[PDB]
Write a protein that binds this ligand. Sequence first.
Ligand SMILES: *[C@@H]1O[C@H](CO)[C@@H](O)[C@H](O)[C@H]1NC(=O)CCCCCCC(C)C
Ligand SMILES: *[C@@H]1O[C@H](CO)[C@@H](O)[C@H](O)[C@H]1NC(C)=O
Ligand SMILES: *[C@@H]1O[C@H](CO)[C@@H](O)[C@H](O)[C@@H]1O
Lengths: 259, 7
Amino acid sequence: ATRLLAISPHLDDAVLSFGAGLAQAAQDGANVLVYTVFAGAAQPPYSPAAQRMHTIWGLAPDDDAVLYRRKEDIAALDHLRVAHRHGRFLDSIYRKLPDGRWLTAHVEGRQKLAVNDHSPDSDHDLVGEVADDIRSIIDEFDPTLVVTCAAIGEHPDNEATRDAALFATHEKNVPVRLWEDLPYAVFKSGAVELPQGFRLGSADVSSVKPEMRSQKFQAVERYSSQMVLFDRLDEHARQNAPHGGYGETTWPVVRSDDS
Amino acid sequence: XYXXXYX
Ligand SMILES: *[C@@H]1O[C@H](CO)[C@@H](O)[C@H](O)[C@H]1NC(=O)CCCCCCC(C)C
Ligand SMILES: *[C@@H]1O[C@H](CO)[C@@H](O)[C@H](O)[C@H]1NC(C)=O
Ligand SMILES: *[C@@H]1O[C@H](CO)[C@@H](O)[C@H](O)[C@@H]1O
């Protein structure tokens, strides 16, 4: 039996990036679990940046935004008929730096967010924490395959998720693959810097039935808060394997020579 | 760096 563990950074990323792979796995009778790492329930007060994001998402600025998101995630994943697990790490907009500053600051005029300068110590400590949680889930669920994000777009939460997954899957002897982060891959290079000792294998551009694209995009629409689109995604996918259907690009990750 | 969007 095939047990697919998809490790999403935020509530929507696995469906947005890999919703057709999840839909295909489900269709094939695989046992599928989407664990979202940064699904921690944030406790107020919220930062100026979080409060702005919440209002952008159509919420009162002091509302329980993570609860709202978690319910959208359950709706989207039940549409795909796959399991969820909501992890305890706080989204970037809720995190504090060890000196008390918010991790992310609000920036005026469309830019939204930028991350505060800080020492790498706290980024490395976050990876080890996330890696401990992934190792426990690997022990419990016993996946035959783990898929997580490439962190195209360099979101710090996606980078932490990716790095933690690479360390945990290497220690546990479980194969791992990275998906192309959407929508970031539509407008970013695709080149990422993996932690020392890891490298990408050859890309696989999947070929999915139009039925699987429709089921993915229906599941995307359960994330109401995040929308205010599908055409862009379509053109990126067709642009990846032309003479081909919809598909998603993933890469295996292996150890580099001499590492 | 980081930075928001959508662009
Ligand atoms: C932006 O960063 C926030 C703070 O960390 C995260 O809450 C949020 O998930 C991040 N979003 C993205 O990386 C992609 C946004 C585009 C999503 C719209 C896709 C559909 C409608 C779900
Ligand atoms: C910005 O992101 C929103 C988030 O859903 C998206 O729907 C929209 O297409 C984006 N605006 C652009 C690309 O101008
Ligand atoms: C997206 O992000 C970068 C940095 O702000 C810009 O250089 C680019 O033109 C677009 O605004």
